[model samples]
Target: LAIVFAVLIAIYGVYLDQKIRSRIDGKVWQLPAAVYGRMVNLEPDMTISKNEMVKLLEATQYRQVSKMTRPGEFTVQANSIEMIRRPFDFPDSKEGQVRARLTFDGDHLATIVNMENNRQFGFFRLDPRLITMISSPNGEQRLFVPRSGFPDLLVDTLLATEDTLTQQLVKNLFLSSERSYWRKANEAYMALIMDARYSKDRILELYMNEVYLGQSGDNEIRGFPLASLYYFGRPVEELSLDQQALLVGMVKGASIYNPWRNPKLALERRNLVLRLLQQQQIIDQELYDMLSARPLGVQPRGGVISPQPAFMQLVRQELQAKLGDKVKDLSGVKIFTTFDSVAQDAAEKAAVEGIPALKKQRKLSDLETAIVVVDRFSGEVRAMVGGSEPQFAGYNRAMQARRSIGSLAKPATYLTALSQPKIYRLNTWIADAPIALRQPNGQVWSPQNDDRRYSESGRVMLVDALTRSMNVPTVNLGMALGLPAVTETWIKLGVPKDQLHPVPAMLLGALNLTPIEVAQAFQTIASGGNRAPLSALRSVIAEDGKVLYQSFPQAERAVPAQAAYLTLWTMQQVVQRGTGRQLGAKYPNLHLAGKTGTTNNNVDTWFAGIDGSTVTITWVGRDNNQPTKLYGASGAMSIYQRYLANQTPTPLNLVPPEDIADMGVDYDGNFVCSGGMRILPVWTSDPQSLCQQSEMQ
Candidate 1:
């Protein structure tokens, strides 16, 4: 009885296992949904009428293959025409709009054969590709379309170049089959890296749409259409031939060969693709031979910018805020960012060059600096350097580093006081005496200007005190204006409120702020009071072609227009004849303005400024918060100076609103209010908001 039961139980278990396996394997897979480039939309007046529509096809790279006419068709061309009766058995259209392919050369009024409108898939819903993590300014997820069914030349070239067997199949039957698209694409990507010397466009075009991409299952792989545009934020057809080739070669192992993550492999593969192109006769023998002589030209895979990893990470953060979680796994996205490759390079180079010198001069065991740059008009982050080791992975000084502002906070204190009508003016006398305060910890804090002597020999204008970075004057003014109000202004300027302290020392930049915070804060002066949240990504869209999010730069007026102008004017003095004189030499015509800062123990050095539409902030110090014995002018200012030399300088101009005045002031600091003659402000302190809160301790 037991033997019989055991045999029966074993038989039943095998049956159930087989049944489950069969059920699992029997499930049908769905076809992957396809995405294409943006469909061109017509404008009202610029739109073509139905009769004028033939030209529109030509614009989309459709060739004139034929023409047609029949009874009531009123057609004026050649070829076969089939005009069906009304309603056409369709719900929404008078009838589906007719379509035809043509076969003629350009600029000729010749006729050709036409076939019935029987193209499958072409007439189906022409859905635009849904952008994954990135978006456009208008909230449209950007996409790219094939110029024509894969070009015969490309198909042949890719085949003859990579795999003749697949080539023969594609021409005979694969072209009509969807499976061929993947087989050929995979083969092409594999071959591309083996032969890299094709025209940039050729490589890019093949890469733009046809290459087999990441597997989406159902035997479907993401195609080049969604890969190139999404990966590099440029249209495939618009890509330079060389760029196209780079992209095409990248598809062999999209993630595995990603240039950003596995650059070594990417370069190796790209070189192989170049060599294969020559071997396959896709390119001329001479050109191929010459190109092969050169080393692989694989540049760092970053859109035009510094290509600083830390800065790029911050860019990712900004993108995440703008695009959200969808960025993690995207079909693809189009990104238009405010990054300048040239500026970024300059920033990184300057930081790298300055660090060794800074270490030598400071005589410190370990020292570091964080640098940031921005577009003044667009509020785009242009460049960033987080530490002495720009490539070192640590706290990400540009994104997360928070250090004392030193005298960098002085401008905010002065700006608040100047905003008040009666309390102060740029020309108001600022008594730069001495300051001493007792802290709760029984610590006596005494703040002094680097110059040590107060009043610049006597009481100078408030603006001059700030331009000169006079610590005593800034603190004295902060005490007079009240510390709480200053901190409030900092909050409005985009400084995180958590670090704000209502203390007198905050007047002279005693508060701690991240590089991003400092950069954002200076934006007020750069924009003449207008401020915006900095960003790296432009927009994002969903898989269903729905806009998920878009960033167009949100901005607000955070300070009095006149106050911003005065601050800029006074700050310029810091660069021209003050502590930042080093920059003045190289950027004589830079039209730049800034301030230099040093902490009580020389623990931190800062040089923050604006030139035209760009804002830059640089900080130098040690992680232990110990003195490096380097002053702001020698440490941070040198980096700022070199960055200015390497970067392209732009013109600076302030917008004059209807209610705002652009009159100039004399060196003595008196506002002309309405005179044609103009001069820059000499003082950096604001008088109205000056009042005491807590002592400088």
Candidate 2:
């Protein structure tokens, strides 16, 4: 009977040992996908000031020292800055540590010198930041730090502290802390079983991740990586000796010695761990003395909250759509994104700083706003603002709000007409009189300008009509081109066909669209007529270094380059002399372009500005859909201007294609004897080409 009972114990141990293996091998070590921002590419000719460059290094938690010896330290040398940029693992390869020096020509990065080889590189891309981590479906939020990544000092400190609480993991996992002699017997038995079954390294790795450090609300702060972030606001590898000691001390009693809750107990507990490490010969006496003298360093900002949850939602949605059902089982992926930290930071601050003044000025307590800034060429959304609130809410107005686009719709009408360049020219005149059309619904349809009046000359030049945002001439052009043709242009430029309603009122911005959709439409013109399908994700790499997903921004030619250039030049006119003249007045030499949109009764005030290679769109209005009595320039453009003050903006200097040539149009819509005195693009085959018509004819 005794021999039979021993066999039964062996059978139970075999089954339970497998359970331990599964948990430590898969569940305990499982990690959620990590989201990262764009790398800081400090290339020659890019605009960057000394302070801005310094802040960039600080944002990535790089230390600034007088003499740079470490990978993450930078030294400011008056006009030039030098640093050793840390290495990183990219999709293609692992970039080694770089010892480089960057010289600034006041506003622009002049040169980059590779100190190792004494050679100058035209471009330098530094490692990106871990923007946020996706919460796992299984349980608590924690980053995966492999066994190899656990620093030797951290391992020693943890072991020194856990020695006081010997056999703690077995008690924590297999048995309770009850005063029962049977519980101790079971803990000792399970510990012996685990020791024999698992490798020593595997056992330590499990404890490194599984040991509870503290509590974050309902979520248990497990793992050294999370503990480091929770206490010192950095990764585990970057933690100083004292910081590591503080975290290791909490392994004995996390609740009683929590640094944030009980500083006195935490300091005593941390110093005790340091003393034990010194006695155990894990640390020297000199190091222990210095470490014990330091205070408990806990940062509240590094809690489990995402800096940009709105952007993270976009990433999750993208992941959901791309991965489909496969996303349900996603684990341990490196989701590299196109999240521009500088641009995102600027946009966030601009929204917070710009909203209060607008709220007080508009006299509406519920006035909400959204912003979408994207790379004009790549269609990468750099910055996004859902609303005025800093925290992420369920409602993301930038992507979801279906507000009227107002005069913004006029660009589609003009683009459609210009697509048939043989018939329409910027110099061509169209009647802007009070015109009424009989609809198929047996109703009279008419459109009016914001001023509710006809052009003084009863006709307006096609380009001037769009620049001035004249509703009558746009409807005339839309009617001539036909609603089908105009609707086709909007769809080709990235607006979904299902969102559009082909009506006369739709020509004057009656159609509703989100700020992201509006940015996509303008991105076509800014990108020289290519429809850029925008995305936040760049690539996804799995734990074993297998490539899962990669994003290559699709650029399809949707509009004729000549027609697009004509439309683009016409937009510059909007900034040069029309509603957006205020921004133009400030940066006249920058050759910037913009368009303003004020919806019916000012329900939605919109502005889309193109500077250099980026398009920033802003919208301001009350959440209840009430009119705020604001125009696009007075409302949305103000935010854009505020953002401009924070970040250095590039200039929009697009070179027209070969078939397109420059020409000037008169106020009377004639090719010769120019009155407006503006240089605009026109098809070379035009009978009124400026090279032939103005200089010769």
Candidate 3:
């Protein structure tokens, strides 16, 4: 009975194996369509020249060939054309032998990418060489043009640098139909285990884009193109022969032999690639030894690719802006971003120069900061720097760093009262007295000024409170205006719904808000109460040449034009003689309006300022949330002043609110004469509420 059962089981197993093999044989590999991402193309105002392009390409490791008459497709001439060549000896073949006929035609066509129906699709439905419809994804396609064989030396060098198996393995892999999941593993691993037969070309082709070349962090690695940049600070093909080998050798175990953190181990692996070439007789041992002993050099390119994270973060801000996560991941999408290069350069320079000195003064090394500058009228990102290491993966300080804004929150608070002209004015009286607040946790909070002093008996104009950034009077005005009312002003200005809550701390920028929120809040003020949600991306095109997504500068008419104007005018006092006085001294002719802020214990400092066309918010703080050693006026505002020496302000003209006639007023929010003395209003909202001081000082 046992013998019969064993025989039956063996027969069934054999049948199952045969069935699986048959299915595998019939499976065809799904060819991915050619994709097009946004490319930095030749532009009219761009500074890059032809000479620079040559250097860039050479650095990226592309081999130079004899000059050809025509441009377009890379190929050879039909007739015998005398070719001036370099590097006379190609050890593997006859140095000047023309073994194969090569041809070039100007009228010939090549394949490319395009889009259809707001979706990514390809145009090249058939491979010209194969004369059959190419098997692609549901809508896969590409356009192709035939070219002469690649230069022998160029091909040979890349093989030596990247993959030794490219020549033999690539052809067979492309020719054979791919199998299903389990079968694919079986074929790949089995071929590896059993095949000296699987050839070098196959491995080289598959591994070029897949191998791990260098480490970014614990789990992240710089892949093919990125890996090249990581080690060389330039593109892959731009690397020198030695640089190329260093990159290739580092691919096996990135962390264990990382060049940045572990130079000795990395050098050893690089020598290994050169030694392997010598053993293969691809190069003489003398040449290998000479090259291997040289020091491996790499540039420091640790900054973020995009200077503006808020602009880049716009892809995540709007539901429509989400193209694929990567530009190349799309089939035929081209994204034309509305990034102004000049503006970007200015912003980056400002942030880079602004932070380090203040950081050193504060006695901190990891000086964390975030800055965002935008074209207030156009709602376009002018510049943004998110952190000290703008490239490090931390909370994007410009978009995500939510620090207590100090008195920066007061302008929006005061703007809400300005909505009622009769109730609020620059001349209105308020006592700069102390306030005590009971927390929900049953703790009593005491608010104090940066200098730890408060006014005892005197009344001051609303303008005085703002100009001095006085906490006592500002808090009193805020509580009297009603916390809900202040919060509503913030809401209408585009503060996230979850962030709107009535609390006394909100009056002093104690409400936690990101630098971006501060930017939008002030942007509304700058644009005469019209709220324009900041946008990073301008348009998105699919892998194909079809428009998949787009956006315009849409300003939500959220605030009263006149009320916002009043706030802006009052803020001008801040720059003229208020907290931002240093900025005024620097850019005396620039005509800017700004407010300075410093939280309790100096944890965070801020300067939210705007001109006619631009609004910039600068925040200085520690990533660990420790108090900074400098004050807001001394620290953050100084950075803004240094940044403005070269910055030009845009022109803005918005109508002031009906209540705020362009008349001069005293610090008590009351009308004043051209002289600096206090004067009584002929018609007051309430005579008892008006101020009656003899001298403004």
How many clashes in each structure?
60, 0, 42
C-alpha lDDT of candidate 1 relative to the true structure = 0.58
| Cα-lDDT of candidate 2 | 0.78
Q: Write the per-residue lDDT of candidate 1 for residues 644-681, one digit (tens) a residue.
A: 77654554554443333333554544554344243443
Indicate whether candidate 1 or candidate 2 has the larger lDDT. Answer: 2
Q: For candidate 3, what is the TM-score?
A: 0.58
Give the runs in model 1 whose Cα sits over 4 Å from its true position: 1-154, 161-308, 326-330, 360-365, 388-394, 438-445, 456-458, 542-546, 654-697
lDDT of each: 0.58, 0.78, 0.57
lDDT tens string, model 3, 520-564?
888887887888888655565443346667667688886776677
Candidate 2: where are CA atoms >4 Å away?
1-28, 40-52, 68-71, 95-97, 106-123, 164-166, 170-184, 192-202, 214-219, 230-232, 253-307, 440-443, 665-667, 673-676, 685-697
RMSD of each: 15.2, 3.5, 13.5
Q: Highest TM-score among the candidates is held by which one? A: 2
